[PDB]
């Protein structure tokens, strides 16, 4: 895509009274938004090519 540099992304789960500490002096791609895991349940990532308003 025109770019010859690379970006490497990382993730972690931050437990409810824990804290995450970033320290950087460059090349940092900073979080702005994170995601609260509100509902854990049984779900799935279905690989499909389709997109039906039915139930």
């Amino acid at each position: 895509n025109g770019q010859s540099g690379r970006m490497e992304f990382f993730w972690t789960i931050l437990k409810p009274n824990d804290a995450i500490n970033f320290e950087s002096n460059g090349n940092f791609i900073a979080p702005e938004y994170a995601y609260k895991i509100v509902k854990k349940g049984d779900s799935a990532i279905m690989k499909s090519e389709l997109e039906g308003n039915c139930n």
């Binding site: 799935a44 990532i45 279905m46 690989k47």
Partner: protein, 173 residues
């Protein structure tokens, strides 16, 4: 089949009997007609229904495949995971196919057995009071009115009541 009745010594079923699986066709002076043996029919219905329900029941703890994703350097466990899934899918497909094949065979022979038992139920009542035609039919050595027909059908045949008139009719023969 296994018991020699269905498509055996009774060569053919009756389109005419429609209120059950097994039963009787009588023929006297008052007239003829088909009737189902309610008791042996209900027993078979209960047996087959429990069988069907038992087969469906035994399969509730069957394997359920789950989507799992892997990357280019996880090809081994990807393949392991696939073999595991196909592995159980193949086992349970065998189990369902085989169970159906095996119990089908037993079911056909079960009906054969219910029929052969019904024939024997009548035979053991009639004894020498009737002649085994050898086709599922018994020719009586006495007069069997509709009420008498009903006694054979509900297992209350009074053998000695007809014993004498039967014996006399056997001996002029």
């Amino acid at each position: 089949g296994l018991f020699g009745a269905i498509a055996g010594f009774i060569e053919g079923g009756w389109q005419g009997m429609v209120d059950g699986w097994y039963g009787y066709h009588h023929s006297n002076e008052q007239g003829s007609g088909y009737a189902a043996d309610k008791e042996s029919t209900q027993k078979a219905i209960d047996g087959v229904t429990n069988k069907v329900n038992s087969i469906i029941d035994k399969m509730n703890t069957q394997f359920e495949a789950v989507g799992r994703e892997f990357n280019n350097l996880e090809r081994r466990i990807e393949n392991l995971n696939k073999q595991m899934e196909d592995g159980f899918l193949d086992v349970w497909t065998y189990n369902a196919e085989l169970l159906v094949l095996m119990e089908n065979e037993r079911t056909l022979d079960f009906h054969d057995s219910n029929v052969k038992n019904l024939y024997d139920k009548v035979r053991l009542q009639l004894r020498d009071n009737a002649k085994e035609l050898g086709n599922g039919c018994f020719e009586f050595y006495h007069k069997c009115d509709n009420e008498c027909m009903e006694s054979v059908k509900n297992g209350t045949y009074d053998y000695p009541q007809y014993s004498e008139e039967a014996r006399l009719n056997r001996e002029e023969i």
